[PDB]
Amino acid sequence: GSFVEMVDNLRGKSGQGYYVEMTVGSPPQTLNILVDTGSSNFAVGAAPHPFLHRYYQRQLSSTYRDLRKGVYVPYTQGKWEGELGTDLVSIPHGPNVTVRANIAAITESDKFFINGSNWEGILGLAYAEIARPDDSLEPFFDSLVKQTHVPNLFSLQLCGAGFPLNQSEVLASVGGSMIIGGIDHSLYTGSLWYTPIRREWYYEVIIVRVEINGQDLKMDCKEYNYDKSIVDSGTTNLRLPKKVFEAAVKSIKAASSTEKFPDGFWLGEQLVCWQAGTTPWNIFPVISLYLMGEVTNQSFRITILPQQYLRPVEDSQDDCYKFAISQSSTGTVMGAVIMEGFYVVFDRARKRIGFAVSACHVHDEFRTAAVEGPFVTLDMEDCGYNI
Numbered sequence: 393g394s395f396v397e398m399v400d401n402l403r404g405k406s407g408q409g410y411y412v413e414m415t416v417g418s419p420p421q422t423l424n425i426l427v428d429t430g431s432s433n434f435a436v437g438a439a440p441h442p443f444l445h446r447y448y449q450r451q452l453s454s455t456y457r458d459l460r461k462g463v464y465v466p467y468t469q470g471k472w473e474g475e476l477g478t479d480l481v482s483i484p485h486g487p488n489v490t491v492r493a494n495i496a497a498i499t500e501s502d503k504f505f506i507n508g509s510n511w512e513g514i515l516g517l518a519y520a521e522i523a524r525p526d527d528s529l530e531p532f533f534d535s536l537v538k539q540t541h542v543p544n545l546f547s548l549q550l551c552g553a554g555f556p557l558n559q560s561e562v563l564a565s566v567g568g569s570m571i572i573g574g575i576d577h578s579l580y581t582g583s584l585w586y587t588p589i590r591r592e593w594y595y596e597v598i599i600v601r602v603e604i605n606g607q608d609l610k611m612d613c614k615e616y617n618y619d620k621s622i623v624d625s626g627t628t629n630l631r632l633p634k635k636v637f638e639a640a641v642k643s644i645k646a647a648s649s650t651e652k653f654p655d656g657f658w659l660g661e662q663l664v665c666w667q668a669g670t671t672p673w674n675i676f677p678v679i680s681l682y683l684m685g686e687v688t689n690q691s692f693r694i695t696i697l698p699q700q701y702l703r704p705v706e707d708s709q710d711d712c713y714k715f716a717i718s719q720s721s722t723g724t725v726m727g728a729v730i731m732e733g734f735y736v737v738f739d740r741a742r743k744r745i746g747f748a749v750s751a752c753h754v755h756d757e758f759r760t761a762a763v764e765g766p767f768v769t770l771d772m773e774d775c776g777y778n779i
């Protein structure tokens with residue numbers, strides 16, 4: 393329906409993350425927390441760090457409970473270490489409830505905090521299977537559902553501005569919505585289409601076909617999900633398995649061949665700039681990902697524009713971007729730049745993820761993002777990778 397209290401409760405951007413305000417402890421300690429659908433721990437800065445202007449102070453909370461256990465979490469881009477405990481947690485622009493949740497108090501980290509991101513912790517919204525140190529550490533959303541009458545579903549509208557936001561602008565700007573326990577109809581246009589959650593660990597999905605400007609990439613669909621495909625708000629880019637990335641970049645280069653870009657642009661390292669207002673969107677192709685539907689032999693597609701996969705960056709008055717599609721050795725990752733095109737419903741109760749065109753997606757007068765279906769698609773279970 394309508395969830396006014398939660399609409400516009402996010403801030404941030406694809407490159408540094410989208411975050412929501414939360415409170416921890418008694419009296420409440422306010423912290424900004426990264427919304428991360430790609431992990432399952434609630435972990436917050438709990439000791440001084442050069443990039444933090446506030447942190448969780450356990451000694452000032454009367455409701456803090458020490459679990460007397462450490463946690464070490466190495467990830468490819470960095471690491472975080474901490475001390476486990478529980479405390480009372482609330483979301484001010486959320487459901488009007490307080491829950492007792494697990495909190496990892498971060499004591500040491502490497503490439504975790506981002507200078508100028510304005511967040512002090514992460515909210516891992518995925519399932520207990522990938523919680524650290526193990527699946528006995530109940531994730532936040534599981535605690536929320538178990539302790540309250542909040543429905544077992546949340547939905548995300550991540551709003552890319554379509555241009556760079558300076559330090560002051562990114563702090564003052566509305567970055568989107570996290571609707572806890574429901575679907576807000578004002579955040580999308582058209583219909584919601586659902587794909588099954590293949591397995592409850594990451595938010596795993598199955599891609600069954602890929603097109604670049606309607607041209608089929610024509611790879612064995614297992615390649616698209618090798619070794620998994622996930623929906624992850626805590627990754628910036630659309631990341632594709634090595635072989636898929638090579639074929640997709642070849643096709644995107646061919647479609648955009650009226651302009652030549654340096655190798656560093658395609659590697660997602662170097663920015664490209666155009667005179668103010670002259671970005672040649674029309675030379676870049678749309679990308680369609682077909683996802684398994686809820687009905688046997690049925691799929692649907694989500695279509696993104698270059699306004700999603702070209703990420704705005706500051707250089708001058710030029711309009712500059714980085715290519716936000718990159719290679720992966722751990723499967724497809726539908727990151728924040730893809731999520732910015734859509735309202736995404738994480739329907740845990742019905743083991744499915746919904747997509748609809750976002751009411752805040754960036755587009756031009758000639759093209760828009762799309763969510764369309766149905767399409768007849770056979771042997772879709774064969775697209776899933778095993779082992």
Ligand SMILES: CN1C(=N)N[C@](CCC2CCCCC2)(C[C@H]2CCC[C@@H](NC3CCCC3)C2)C1=O
Nearest residue numbers: 407408409428430431467504522624626627628
């Ligand atoms: C890709 N990915 C995530 N989605 N979460 C983590 C942990 C994954 C866990 C590791 C343990 C196993 C299960 C998966 C850490 C998180 C830390 C803070 C920074 C953030 N990325 C920034 C924020 C926005 C863009 C880039 C990454 C990660 O590596």
